[PDB]
Design a protein around this ligand. Structure first.
Ligand code: NA
Length: 190
């Protein structure tokens, strides 16, 4: 169903839907691991389905249609605790590349594409445990796609080899994120 911001479980999958207070976003949970989002001149929002908690060896499948009109990501997205980390394995994106706001540490060739690996520090920013300073890890896929499988271990291990430590996993979803843009997306996770 179309729901308001929050977290929970739907048809066997964890979901999280968050936004910054700006309107224009409609997030809808569908059957199984499906969800859809339509946004018209939103602010920042993140919504998707997956698992609570995630694991460090999950092979995540996703498929659907992704039509961003501006700044947006389609990623495997999640958090760890001790250390507190917000991470992304970006499979597709709109007009804004994460490389802008981040620093590059290396590359990994995974699931058919090279990904560039970055770290950034979020200072005094919102998080799963409230306002906090924490690191952000990124793998950004060079060849954008709308379906396939992501072997998360490929990325977590590559990050580790670059000195990026991950804590105990909290949630792990396939999420559509938007940032002051418009767009539409419909995705099934498994
Ligand atoms: Na801040």
């Amino acid at each position: 169903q179309t729901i308001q911001p929050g977290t929970g479980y739907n048809n066997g999958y964890f979901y999280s839907y968050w936004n910054d207070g700006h309107g224009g976003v409609t997030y809808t949970n569908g059957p199984g691991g499906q969800f859809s989002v339509n946004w018209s001149n939103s602010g920042n929002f993140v919504g998707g389905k997956g698992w609570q908690p995630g694991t460090k060896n999950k092979v995540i499948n996703f498929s659907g249609s992704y039509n961003p009109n501006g700044n947006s990501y389609l990623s495997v997205y999640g958090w760890s605790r001790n250390p507190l980390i917000e991470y992304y394995i970006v499979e597709n994106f709109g007009t804004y590349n994460p490389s802008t706001g981040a620093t590059k540490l290396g590359e990994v060739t995974s699931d058919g594409s090279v990904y560039d690996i970055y770290r950034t520090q979020r200072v005094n920013q919102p998080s799963i445990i409230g306002t906090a300073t924490f690191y952000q890890y990124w793998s950004v896929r060079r060849n954008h796609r709308s379906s396939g499988s992501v072997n998360t271990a490929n990325h977590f291990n590559a990050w580790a080899q670059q000195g990026l430590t991950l804590g105990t996993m909290d949630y792990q979803i396939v999420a559509v994120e938007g940032y002051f843009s418009s767009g539409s997306a419909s995705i099934t996770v498994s």
